[PDB]
RNA sequence: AGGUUUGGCACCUCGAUGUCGGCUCAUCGCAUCCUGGGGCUGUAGUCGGUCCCAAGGGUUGGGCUGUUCGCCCAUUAAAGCGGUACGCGAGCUGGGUUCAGAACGUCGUGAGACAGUUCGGUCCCUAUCCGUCGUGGGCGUAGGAAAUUUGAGAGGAGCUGUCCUUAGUACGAGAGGACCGGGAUGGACAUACCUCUGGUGUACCAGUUGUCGUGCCAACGGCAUAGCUGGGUAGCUAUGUGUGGACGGGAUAAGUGCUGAAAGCAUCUAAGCAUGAGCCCCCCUCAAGAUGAGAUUUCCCAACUUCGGUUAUAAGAUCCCUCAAAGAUGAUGAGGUUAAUAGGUUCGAGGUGGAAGCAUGGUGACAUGUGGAGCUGACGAAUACUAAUCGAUCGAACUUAAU
RNA sequence: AAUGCCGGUGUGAGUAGCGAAAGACGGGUGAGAAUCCCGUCCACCGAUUGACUAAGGUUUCCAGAGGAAGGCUCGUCCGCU
RNA sequence: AGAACAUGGGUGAUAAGGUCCGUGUUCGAAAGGGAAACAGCCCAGACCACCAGCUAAGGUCCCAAAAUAUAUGUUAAGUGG
């Protein structure tokens, strides 16, 4: 379960893993990214860096991107 | 579905067939005109957006709201129409009728509809506590110190600070309200204005919307 | 004043049928009752008190006691349960409102004619 | 309006000139009552004889407040006085004379055995 | 009901940010004059 | 075993952490008072007994006691149990108790005591920071503007009871009494609009009246709470009039259901096999791009430039009349037509018969209009007469792909 | 560094307050006027905010000049120089 | 005026961050690294400079230095019967 709470008196929100994958699964990547980098203010700029897509197509042709495989 | 728009005018009063007292609002909705049609393809979401009162030309040295500006001057040329004092849009219609340019009768709506009405509250000013949320006002004798103040604002060193929402004296109101479930009684097209059953948000000769009740 | 499209759109509703009444009048009103289905007429006799209003939403007040208890019955000039008004009297009076009458026996402290 | 702690005039025949009502009978923190109504209520003053007597702890229902009720037509029936019936909660009057006139909101409260016994329903 | 610690310049000169005069009008008097209060009644040095 | 409420310990506070009940205002829990689902019965039947699941919302008026607590009268669907410095005294009171006076009882040689009673006994503070509820100024966002919007994300609303079938069928050797189906119904609380109706109030509205002092009769004006008494325009209002509310979708929790082996018989489960709510989400209302980035329509720069910037542009401030808005700012209606505000002229509505003349009548007083008259605030209409009717201020690069 | 003693200067902050109580307009003098002077109205005390007389105080009393300080604002005025 | 910790005991209830003795350690009077933070626990005792190197206790996916290291097994639970 994800959790927010938004300051005021009893509102704790939640959210499940699976459903959220379901709904908004861009969220669900880029929130364990960026929980996984310093929260400095170059860390928050650092985590600006990020584009996150469902489905595979994107727009960034004009910069030239080049794929990168995992080297665990 | 169906919405016109407004400006309400007062109460009165109509006897119902079978012998009735029904008291009523007076809505004049006269000069309406559709000015464009915003559609999904282009908008991402369907609606249409209509003007109820004309305003004056586009005058040179012109600076209170009474005469439009060169934007708005051009705009509603395109849809073959004079300047307008209100623009609201509605998308709980059905985009597909709706000519822009089209002229927007107050006989759309018929006698026996079930309606919303929305508005602008009156504006009562800054009001404390007993005005805007209904308190108690403790005793007023028995050597009594607290009157109209409000109680205590929270608890004690353990969470030691207010809460959102404590309720506290402000301005009373202004705002959007609208009222459900209300119901045309008479059609008036001679004069161009509806009767509705009952009692409306904000002051007289203030701007309503009128719609087919969701529910 | 009100406005114009207030006078116009409810214009047709006043009954242009009934006398002049001035408070202080006896009268007696025969309002329509109804039931299973018979439109039986009842009468009420009574001194007018009161007169407020203009337009359609005018308002009158007649008294009567007739039993020991004085009663009150107000309802609108142009309200279509009434068959007619019948004047039974003029009685002169000073006031406008004749609200000067603890009420019981005769001791209705009012003044008649 | 009839609180608690009303005194209420009482028009038939039993020994009954005066009662103090004890509870508005109806909802939850409901406050007043009117013509229609029913309290509950206790005898004040009585007269010598009668079934009720003073002390008694009894049903009634409201015929004819001074804040007369609203009709629909837009219509008026005030009266002069506060008054009450005491009932025997079967819908019937536990005297067996009515004093007074008695509106017709009692026909539709369905209150018919009190509306014949008494004089000039309005 | 008291300062619990002083106050010091930073606050101080911050919180006088909006404590300011507003210029008056600076417009030219119509009929004749010169920058004035706007649309004055204008008779410094002029004529409205 | 689990949770810590009379006690054990003496770790913070004696250069002060200052108070029991009640009032005002809340916010969490579940160990469930009502409502909601279910099952069990030594439940004939309603009655009931009894359990489990269920935390959204609701959960009262008085008499006695300072009381916590407690007994009683009436209701209600119900009148839960807890935490928060036994919630809340820089928000309130001050009845109880730890103060100086006094009476009684008991015990002391006595001064005194008890913890028993009883009467009487001064409740301070102009808010700095954080917090909360409202309302503004600045800047930002790859041309500047005006108006319409999208909605990431927030907040608010989910509660209850009558009359009607059903049904007098089940059932009852007797008296006693099943469950279950439709629209609806018109209610009680609490919400949020509004003033047409009933009512409240109205301190520059009309009328009656008593004392006194001034101009000498009268008629006015001054002061007696607005002197008092009787009515009452607009605005503001409840006790008045409208509207809303589980839920408008199926689907889940002990529970009830299907087929089926280890354990070849058996088996609601083991793989599989469906449901039963107040569960979800939907819905409903409001606010929302300072969401450090999201649109659509129209307008304006054809230049000037070292387009580094400047002037004109679209446009916004300044000032002035104002109110449907208002602490102030802000937000609306307007600025020479024209109807923003005021005067004047007519209404509406209010209160009810002005003066002058006439006719009386002993006179106090009446009539009586060719008089529902004269007066009239904030309502409405129309109107150029007095005014907002001039004029300055501020303001417009890399990259791939095409074509 | 003793809630040390003396002096100076901050903060709170342009914040609390300016001590019961009728005033309006015209004219005059002045660098400067809501506030001083002169009207004509209007209100207040009205067994006293009236007239004396004490104790007590000690020149505050009158005229002309003046506005540094004083006067809870101003001041051309004053029981102030 | 001592304190916690481990071990030996009394008291208390085989309670207490309780209290009283005995044998050690550390704090007191001790900076540095680890235990998230954290006098008393684990490692270790700072004369001064350095942008040199080896190690302790603890560690090696990112925050945050160092094995997404090997080989070989358990776990399916995520952090009175």
Redesign the pocket.
Same mark, same amino acid.
């Given at each position: 379960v994800y959790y927010?709470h938004?300051?005021?008196?009893?509102?704790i929100?939640s959210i499940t893993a699976g459903?959220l994958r379901r709904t908004?699964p861009e969220?669900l990547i880029e929130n364990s990214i960026k929980?996984?980098?310093?929260?400095?203010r170059l860390?928050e700029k650092q985590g600006?860096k990020l584009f996150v897509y469902g489905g595979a197509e994107h727009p960034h042709?004009?910069?030239?991107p080049e794929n990168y495989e995992l080297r665990? | 579905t169906k919405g016109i728009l407004g400006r309400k005018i007062?109460?009165?009063?109509v006897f119902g067939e079978n012998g009735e007292?029904?008291?009523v609002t007076v809505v004049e909705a006269k000069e309406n005109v559709v000015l464009?049609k915003?559609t999904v393809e282009?908008?991402?979401?369907n609606?249409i957006?209509v003007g109820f009162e004309d305003?004056?030309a586009?005058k040179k040295?012109?600076?209170?709201?009474?005469?439009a500006?060169?934007?708005?001057?051009?705009?509603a040329?395109?849809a073959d129409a004079a300047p307008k004092?209100?623009?609201?849009?509605f998308?709980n219609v059905d985009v597909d009728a709706y000519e822009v340019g089209q002229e927007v009768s107050v006989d759309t709506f018929v006698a026996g509809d079930v309606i919303?009405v929305?508005?602008?509250?009156?504006?009562?000013?800054?009001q404390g506590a007993i005005?805007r949320?209904?308190?108690?006002?403790?005793?007023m004798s028995?050597?009594?110190?607290?009157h109209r103040?409000?109680?205590?604002?929270?608890?004690?060193?353990?969470?030691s600070?207010?809460?959102?929402?404590?309720?506290?004296?402000?301005?009373?109101?202004?705002?959007?309200?609208?009222?459900?479930?209300?119901?045309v009684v008479q059609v008036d097209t001679e004069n161009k204005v509806i009767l509705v059953?009952?009692?409306?948000?904000?002051?007289?000769?203030?701007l309503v919307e009128i719609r087919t009740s969701?529910? | 004043?009100?406005?114009?499209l207030i006078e116009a759109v409810t214009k047709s509703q006043l009954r242009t049928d009934l006398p002049?009444?001035?408070?202080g009048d006896t009268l007696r009103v025969h309002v329509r009752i109804i039931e299973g289905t018979r439109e039986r007429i009842q009468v009420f006799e009574g001194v007018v008190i009161?007169?407020?209003?203009?337009?359609?939403?005018?308002?009158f007040?007649v008294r009567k006691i007739s039993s020991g208890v004085g009663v009150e019955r107000?309802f609108?000039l142009h309200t279509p349960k009434i068959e007619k008004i019948e004047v039974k009297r003029r009685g002169?009076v000073?006031?406008?409102?004749l609200?000067?009458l603890s009420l019981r026996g005769k001791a209705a402290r009012i003044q008649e004619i | 309006?009839i609180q608690?702690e009303t005194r209420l005039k009482v028009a038939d025949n039993s020994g009954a000139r005066e009662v103090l009502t004890?509870?508005?009978?109806? &909802?939850?923190?409901? %406050?007043?009552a009117n013509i229609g109504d029913v309290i509950?209520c206790t005898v004040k003053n009585a007269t010598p004889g009668g079934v009720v007597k003073k002390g008694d702890?009894v049903?009634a229902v409201i015929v004819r407040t001074k804040?007369?009720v609203?009709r629909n037509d &837009?219509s008026?029936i %005030?009266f002069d006085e506060n008054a009450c019936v005491i009932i025997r909660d079967d819908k019937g009057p536990r005297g067996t004379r009515i004093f007074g006139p008695v509106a017709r909101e009692l026909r539709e409260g369905n209150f018919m055995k009190i509306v014949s016994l008494a004089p000039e329903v309005l | 009901?008291?300062?619990?610690?002083?106050?010091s310049?930073t606050?101080?000169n911050k919180?006088?940010?909006?404590?300011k005069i507003?210029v008056?009008?600076?417009?030219?008097?119509?009929?004749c004059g010169e920058?004035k209060?706007?649309?004055?009644?204008c008779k410094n040095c002029g004529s409205?």
């Open positions: 927010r938004s300051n005021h008196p009893g509102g929100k459903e908004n969220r929980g996984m980098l310093p929260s400095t860390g600006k042709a004009a910069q030239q665990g | 007062g109460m009165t009063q007292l029904i008291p464009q915003k282009v908008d991402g979401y609606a957006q305003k004056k586009y040295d012109a600076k209170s709201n009474k005469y500006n060169k934007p708005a001057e051009g705009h040329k395109k004092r209100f623009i609201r849009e998308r919303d929305t508005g602008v509250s009156k504006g009562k000013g800054f005005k949320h209904g308190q108690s006002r403790g005793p028995h050597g009594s110190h607290f103040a409000p109680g205590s604002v929270g608890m004690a060193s353990d969470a600070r207010v809460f959102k929402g404590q309720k506290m004296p402000g301005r009373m109101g202004g705002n959007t309200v609208t009222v459900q479930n209300l119901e059953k009952g009692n409306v948000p904000g002051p007289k000769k203030g969701i529910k | 004043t009100n406005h114009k002049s009444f001035r408070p009161k007169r407020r209003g203009g337009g359609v939403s005018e308002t007040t107000t609108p002169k000073r006031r406008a409102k609200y000067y | 309006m608690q004890i509870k508005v009978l109806g &909802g939850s923190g409901r %406050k007043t509950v702890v049903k804040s007369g609203r &837009g008026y %005030k | 009901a008291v300062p619990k610690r002083r106050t310049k606050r101080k919180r006088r940010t909006h404590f507003s008056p009008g600076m417009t030219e008097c119509p009929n920058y209060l706007s649309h004055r009644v409205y």
